[PDB]
């Protein structure tokens, strides 16, 4: 069994039980799940994901403070990743803020303000949820 954890806040985010697809040229992970009623998202309820909200400036302030934190973790763990990290993120941050009204925010269990903020949206069918994480801010245990 594979468990993907946040590299910063050490919070449980998701596992390999869902469909994992790669997007943004290897920058973000596309975790495909389904709606289960025990009604909620299976990926959210199974990993203690705490929901939060951000404004256009607070998220831009956070994502600038968080993407810098991941770049520092790459400089100590995978220095060759720093170059493709800033390139795809600059295009991705401009893609997230452009579609800011379509994403929902979630944080780790500890609710650390420095942790990862996950995004949630729906496919063209409107009922299949998929979550967007940062691939470089995860540790595979």
Author numbering: 1 to 38, 68 to 170
Describing publication, verbatim:
Histamine-Releasing Factor (HRF), also referred to as Translationally Controlled Tumour Protein (TCTP), p21, p23 and fortilin, is ubiquitously expressed in eukaryotes, and involved in apoptosis, cell cycle progression, cell proliferation and cancer (Bommer and Thiele, 2004, Nagano-Ito and Ichikawa, 2012, Bommer, 2012). In addition to its diverse range of intracellular roles, HRF is also able to activate mast cells and basophils, with the release of histamine, implicating a role in allergic disease. HRF can form dimers, and a disulphide-linked dimer was shown to be crucial for the cytokine-like activity of rat HRF. mHRF, hHRF and rat HRF contain two cysteine residues, at positions 28 and 172, and Cys172 is suggested to be the site of the intermolecular disulphide bond. The current model for the activity of HRF in mast cell activation involves cross-linking of FcεRI-bound IgE by dimeric HRF, mediated by interactions between HRF and the Fab regions of IgE.
We report here the first crystal structure of murine HRF (mHRF), solved at 4.0 Å resolution, revealing the conserved HRF fold. The structure of mHRF was solved at 4.0 Å resolution, and contains two molecules in the asymmetric unit. Residues 1–38 and 68–170, and 1–41 and 67–170 were modeled for chains A and B, respectively; similar to other crystal structures of HRF, the mobile loop region (residues Thr39-Val66) was disordered. mHRF contains a C-terminal His-tag, which was also disordered; a substantial region of continuous electron density was observed close to the C-terminus, but the tag could not be modeled with certainty.Fig. 1 mHRF. The overall fold of mHRF is conserved, and comprises three α-helices packed against two β-sheets, while a third β-sheet forms the base of the mobile loop. Like hHRF, mHRF contains two cysteine residues at positions 28 and 172, and thus has the potential to form a covalently-linked dimer; while Cys28 is buried, Cys172 is surface exposed. However, the two molecules of the mHRF asymmetric unit, which are related by non-crystallographic two-fold symmetry, form only non-covalent interactions. The two molecules bury a surface area of 176 Å2 at their interface, in which Glu80-Thr84 from one chain pack against equivalent residues from the other, with a hydrogen bond between Ser82 from each chain. Furthermore, the human and murine proteins are 96% identical, and the residues involved in forming both the disulphide bond and dimer interface are identical.
